[PDB]
Amino acid sequence: SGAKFRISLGLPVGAVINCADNTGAKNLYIISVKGIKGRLNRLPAAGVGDMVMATVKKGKPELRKKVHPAVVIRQRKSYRRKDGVFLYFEDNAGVIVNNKGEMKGSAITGPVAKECADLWPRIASNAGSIA
Amino acid sequence: MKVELCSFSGYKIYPGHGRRYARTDGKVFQFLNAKCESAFLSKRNPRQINWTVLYRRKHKKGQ
Amino acid sequence: SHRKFSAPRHGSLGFLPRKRSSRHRGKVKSFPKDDPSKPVHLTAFLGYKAGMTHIVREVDRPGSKVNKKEVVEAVTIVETPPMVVVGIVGYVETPRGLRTFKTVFAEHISDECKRRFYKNWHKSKKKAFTKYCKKWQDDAGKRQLDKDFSSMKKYCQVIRVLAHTQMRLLPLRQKKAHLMEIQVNGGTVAEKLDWARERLEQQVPVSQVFGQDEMIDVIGVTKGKGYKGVTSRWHTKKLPRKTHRGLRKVACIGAWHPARVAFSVARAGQKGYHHRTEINKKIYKIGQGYLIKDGKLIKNNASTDYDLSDKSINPLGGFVHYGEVTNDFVMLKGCVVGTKKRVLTLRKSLLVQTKRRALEKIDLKFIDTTSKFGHGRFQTVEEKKAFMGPLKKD
RNA sequence: CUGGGUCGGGGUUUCGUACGUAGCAGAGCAGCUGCUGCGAUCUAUUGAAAGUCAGCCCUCGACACAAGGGUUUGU
RNA sequence: AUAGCGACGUCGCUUUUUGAUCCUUCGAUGUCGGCUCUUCCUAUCAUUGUGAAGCAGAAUUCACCAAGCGUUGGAUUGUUCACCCACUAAUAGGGAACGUGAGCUGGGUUUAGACCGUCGUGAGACAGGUUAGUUUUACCCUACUGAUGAUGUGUUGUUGCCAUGGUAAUCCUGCUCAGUACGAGAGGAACCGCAGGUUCAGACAUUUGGUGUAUGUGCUUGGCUGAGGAGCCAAUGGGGCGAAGCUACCAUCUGUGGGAUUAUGACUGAACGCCUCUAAGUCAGAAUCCCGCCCAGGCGGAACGAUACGGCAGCGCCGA
RNA sequence: AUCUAAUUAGUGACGCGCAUGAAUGGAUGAACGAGAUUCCCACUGUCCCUACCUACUAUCCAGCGAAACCACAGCCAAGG
RNA sequence: GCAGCCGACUUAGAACUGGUGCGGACCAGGGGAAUCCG
RNA sequence: UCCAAGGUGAACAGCCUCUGGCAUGUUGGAACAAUGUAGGUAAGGGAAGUCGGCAAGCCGGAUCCGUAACUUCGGGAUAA
Ligand SMILES: [Mg+2]
Ligand SMILES: [Mg+2]
Ligand SMILES: [Mg+2]
Ligand SMILES: [Mg+2]
Ligand SMILES: [Mg+2]
Ligand SMILES: [Mg+2]
Ligand SMILES: [Mg+2]
Ligand SMILES: [Mg+2]
Ligand SMILES: [Mg+2]
Ligand SMILES: [Mg+2]
Ligand SMILES: [Mg+2]
Ligand SMILES: [Mg+2]
Ligand SMILES: [Mg+2]
Ligand SMILES: [Mg+2]
Ligand SMILES: [Mg+2]
Ligand SMILES: [Mg+2]
Ligand SMILES: [Mg+2]
Ligand SMILES: [Mg+2]
Ligand SMILES: [Mg+2]
Ligand SMILES: [Mg+2]
Ligand SMILES: [Mg+2]
Ligand SMILES: [Mg+2]
Ligand SMILES: [Mg+2]
Ligand SMILES: [Mg+2]
Ligand SMILES: [Mg+2]
Ligand SMILES: [Mg+2]
Ligand SMILES: [Mg+2]
Ligand SMILES: [Mg+2]
Ligand SMILES: [Mg+2]
Ligand SMILES: [Mg+2]
Ligand SMILES: [Mg+2]
Ligand SMILES: [Mg+2]
Ligand SMILES: [Mg+2]
Ligand SMILES: [Mg+2]
Ligand SMILES: [Mg+2]
Ligand SMILES: [Mg+2]
Ligand SMILES: [Mg+2]
Ligand SMILES: [Mg+2]
């Protein structure tokens, strides 16, 4: 019912992030950010809880040389909650999902940001820890 | 509000200030400012930093 | 040939003469529209920018996550000591505009107000209004100005109270008080005038001009930045590193056959110190100044009903580059134009607002008073001493 | 009898615990028959020392200074 | 036949393709692209308002007013072109000396060095390929950006008016409506609310981040002042932390109302006994237009204050 | 075919070779190259997307002081 | 084979110790897989 | 062309000093705007920039381990 608030975005196109699931992929090469219109010379960038297109540069052979939708769950750029706390994680990590939203994998390693959790309910179910 | 303590310095965190930090294995930590944050990231032990509440408590200073 | 790739133009031509403002005090270009139905009231005020701080407040808006939650918001402190009303000026509509008709001044004018009439108070003999003031204590002058009041009532359609601020109470170097004309919006001209004629040479606090959780406009002058290049004046794209004759420039001024530099092309020059009017700033708190109540003074003008402390709005060590505020102030959400200790004009909203944001009630539960002269750590000196314990200095 | 200015004093804040002195604290080592010397470092004095408007806040402490100088302007 | 197309014909428009010519320039107008930046056109891709479908809904076609606002990020290539990946609401087309080299770059063409293929007996040639190859000058005039000032009101000052210019906001998603209208089913809307976001604009520093020669405070290398203490030199010795100040969609705040009307749909109503939105008269009507809000303030005005000694004097008003 | 999400690039093959080919030398090749190309790791202000700091300038002043260039000069729209 | 007296820079090992900092300034090779040519 | 101190250090390297020499390189003062020239530092990303990783940045000394394909058997090699 409530769309996500604007948060700082620190993952432009061309960033490789950890893949925190059991799909076998170990990398996620951000390809483009869904819902981004952009302007001249402006790289599309993604933050926590944003669906992106990604390719696997290191992992199971059948997951490579292909384009997968993915969702970013942890970022290292500090972002400001509306309650006034600046939060940033240890690493940039995401999971592989399809267009509908449910994960391709089954479990998530490490914490999951609250912004991702309340926006993608299916990921929150598998999230071991929150925020 | 939830007035709360700094992970490294042990001071009092007020709602507008400070910075939150989340490690890959959970264990959410909280820092008063970049001073304490950089000390914690460089893995300085608070017991040997003089201006820390942990150091003062361990050396029984004050009271 | 056309542009291969399109892009919105940099900057706005709506603020085109990017020159230093010809005035230092914000000018009210348009007052709220008058209607005789409402009772008489002022429409503007003068304050001084002091600083910014946090507030923690509960949010009441169904639909969003912040509903029934609490958030922190930046607020700006504006010190507003009560104004002094020292005249009234009438205006009559003409086919050529709105021409001033007559001004009437009070008998007693403070020397801090008379400072404004002199470019050098020290060498002057302070002779302003000395002969004018004699019109009030003689029958000739009394019947001279009473029919003037009558003529203003008969022929004037706009009445503006000429009122000056009171810089004696401010912690500033300046003693020359500002003054301005605040239009009076209310009933017909007769009562609109015979209501100001007794407000003459009297106090007007901001609490009876504005109210809480009201949306107002702030008119001021931006912070000056001096001569700036194009890449900082207009935020154009920076040229690549291989450029020969500098890279913080604009590559192509214009085409050939227009044969001139158009006014729409970004050029280097003056940045800052511009006149700006920002609308829809919400009052959060109309504070109450220091006052002596039975010997001791009341100082807890920053104590909420959820905090119950004895801390003033002043932070530890006072406001940086301004001082400490001891008069009634106004707390505005967000940032406002100008620098520290800069004079600001508060103006009532020109628009009628029926929106959740405009009509939202405000109930603070915490005002941050930690030091701004660095990373503040303690709200008040008492709690700082309680935490620290005794020191070597005592 | 008012004004700013300089200095000083507090407030805030930055860094992190000064010199000296003391210690049966100190890897040990040398000399004199337990004592005396060298010894990075450690503990106490010591949230100590130092800086803090030059564009931070308050002072009512001290000091001198401030009733000036020049050029013009008439319906 | 004419929702949508349209053969065989036939009439036009444009100078964003190429030709044709050789009028200007050979005592030289710097000759491809890309980057940057502004403005303009409409032959409208999207958005606003409409009309028509072989328009049930959804989607999609055709047409009208319309250029206000948008029209992206990349792989390959010197490319213009082209193709592909992805996002999007859409990834429409063009002009401005095939805009823009005293703005850049110089990858390509186009000197001199070389290599290969074909041609030539040969020197050499090749809109064949390849590699390396100096990109000069503004202090003048104007234009433009800002900064003093001039101009009259007797001199000055304060408060003001607005003639004129400029002008700015834009699009999307979620929720609800609603699994509803519609439809056999599959599917599947809309307005009104509510919460947000994109691009743009104007600010600002509480907070987060950046800078840091307060050369502020510790640490530390080499040398130097006999040593301690205190310091200094190494073109900022190096390195932690850092006040203030600047500063970031890398933080935070704000972004508006009317009027006449276009297309179109209508009312009354003749011409033409009926009919007709039109002839006379009348109505609703929009990202358009104009103004408001906002920025500047005219060889444009207004109201008001004070208006030059006490030895001299200068002044103002009056003495029809 | 491989490399990429995507490759007029690169590499490996195919050979009907406009117009390859044997001291006008053919093929290969360790070591070397301020030689020409492609990809990968690391690194980074090249970029997203800019900001701040320092030194010398530029700026103003005292003194001292040229040159290029110059028909006359210098606000525009359209017309011819 | 021992005793006494002089001595020049090295190398290795150990303990203690500092806020993990130690070629602390200065000096001071980025790397790998390939193709073409010589 | 000849003479050539001390410390650090492999070193006649770089940095500091002594004997000897000099007065900042044909002017000074006040400011600290833009744009430059020469140095630096930047959150998150890490070549997405560009014809092209141009420029800048990473590594860097010494000691102890370890060191591949290929090879003209010498090397590659301070490989990594
Ligand atoms: Mg680009
Ligand atoms: Mg275009
Ligand atoms: Mg160049
Ligand atoms: Mg501060
Ligand atoms: Mg020319
Ligand atoms: Mg020429
Ligand atoms: Mg049209
Ligand atoms: Mg040119
Ligand atoms: Mg070339
Ligand atoms: Mg050649
Ligand atoms: Mg000059
Ligand atoms: Mg206008
Ligand atoms: Mg800050
Ligand atoms: Mg900081
Ligand atoms: Mg800072
Ligand atoms: Mg010492
Ligand atoms: Mg030297
Ligand atoms: Mg730092
Ligand atoms: Mg209307
Ligand atoms: Mg009509
Ligand atoms: Mg109408
Ligand atoms: Mg490539
Ligand atoms: Mg091949
Ligand atoms: Mg042959
Ligand atoms: Mg032969
Ligand atoms: Mg041959
Ligand atoms: Mg001079
Ligand atoms: Mg080969
Ligand atoms: Mg050779
Ligand atoms: Mg010098
Ligand atoms: Mg000299
Ligand atoms: Mg000389
Ligand atoms: Mg010289
Ligand atoms: Mg960075
Ligand atoms: Mg980093
Ligand atoms: Mg590109
Ligand atoms: Mg290089
Ligand atoms: Mg090798």
DSSP C196-220: HHHHTTEEE-GGGT--TT-EEEEEE
**Nearest-CA distance from A37 to chain B in Å?**
31
Within 8 A of A110 by CB-CB distance, chain B residues are 24-26
User: C229 near C267, Cβ under 8 Å?
Assistant: no
User: C72 near A84, Cβ under 8 Å?
Assistant: yes
Strand, helix or coil at C21? Answer: coil
Strand, helix or coil at C117? Answer: helix
Nucleotide lying nearest to A10, CA to C1' measure: H44
Distant-in-sequence, close-in-space partners of B27: CB < 8 Å, separation ≥ 6: none
For C7, the token pair is 């892009």
Closest CA to C283 of C362, C349, C166: C362
PDB experimental method: cryo-EM
Tell me the count of A-B CB pairs closer than 8 A: 37
Contact check, Cβ <8 Å, C375/B1? no
User: What are the φ and ψ backbone dihedral angles of C310, each rounded to 5 degrees?
Assistant: -125, 45
Q: Is the Cβ atom of A10 within 7 Å of strand H at any atom?
A: yes
Task: Fill in the amino acid letter for A13.
Answer: V
State the distance from the centre of ligand 32 to the C-alpha of C118, rounded, in angstroms.
59
To one decimal, the resolution in angstroms is 2.8
CB-CB: which of B19, B23, B26 is closest to A86? Answer: B19
Q: What does R_g of chain A's alpha carbons equal in angstroms?
A: 14
Q: Is the Cβ atom of C258 within 7 Å of strand E at any atom?
A: yes
Q: Which residue has the tokens 């070597």?
A: C392
Q: Is A8 exposed, middle or buried (0-12, 13-18, 19+ CB in 10 A)?
A: middle
State the distance from the centre of ligand 3 to the C-alpha of C245, rounded, in angstroms.
9
Contact check, Cβ <8 Å, B16/C375? no
- Measured to protein CB atoms, the chain E nucleotides within 7 Å are 34-40, 69-74, 81, 85-91, 93-100, 102-106, 136, 143-148, 157-163, 165-168, 173-175, 194-210, 240-247, 249-257, 292-297, 300, 302-307
For C47, the token pair is 């304050």
Closest CA to A70 of A121, A1, A18: A18
Residue of C nearest to A3 (CA): C64
Closest CA to C176 of C164, C186, C184, C188: C164
Q: Is the Cβ atom of B45 within 7 Å of strand G at any atom?
A: yes
The whole-number Å distance from C170's CA to H31's C1' is: 32
For C318, the token pair is 């006072």
User: C369 near C314, Cβ under 8 Å?
Assistant: yes
Exposure string for C29-51, b = 16+ CB within 10 A, e = fewer: eebbebeeeeebebbbbbbbbbb
Contact check, Cβ <8 Å, A2/C63? yes
User: What are the φ and ψ backbone dihedral angles of C289, each rounded to 5 degrees?
Assistant: -70, 170
Closest CA to C290 of C141, C133, C390, C169: C169
Q: Does the beta carbon of B59 lie under 8 angstroms from any beta carbon of chain A?
A: no
Q: Is the Cβ atom of C4 within 7 Å of strand H at any atom?
A: no
Contact check, Cβ <8 Å, C389/B12? no
User: What are the φ and ψ backbone dihedral angles of C51, each rounded to 5 degrees?
Assistant: 175, -170
Q: What is the distance between the alpha carbons of residues A17 and C326, in angstroms, rounded to a whole number?
A: 54
Q: Find which of A42, A82, A85, A116 to mutate to test the C interface (most C CBs within 10 Å of its CB).
A: A82
Residue of C nearest to A84 (CA): C72
Per the DSSP assignment, residues forming a β-bridge with A112 are: A130
Q: Is the Cβ atom of A130 within 7 Å of strand H at any atom?
A: no
Distant-in-sequence, close-in-space partners of C350: CB < 8 Å, separation ≥ 6: C30, C32, C33, C217, C279
Residue C270 belongs to what H/E stretch?
strand C269-271
Contact check, Cβ <8 Å, B20/A88? yes
Q: Does the beta carbon of B14 lie under 8 angstroms from any beta carbon of chain A?
A: no
Q: What is the distance between the alpha carbons of residues C352 and A118, in angstroms, rounded to a whole number?
A: 37
Closest CA to C29 of C347, C271, C260, C352: C347
For A36, the token pair is 């981004």
Q: Does the beta carbon of A10 lie under 8 angstroms from any beta carbon of chain B?
A: no
Secondary structure (DSSP) of C172-192? SS-----EEEEEEESS-HHHH
Distant-in-sequence, close-in-space partners of C22: CB < 8 Å, separation ≥ 6: none
User: A113 near A5, Cβ under 8 Å?
Assistant: no
Within 8 A of C366 by CB-CB distance, chain B residues are 1, 15
State the distance from the centre of ligand 8 to the C-alpha of C257, rounded, in angstroms.
12
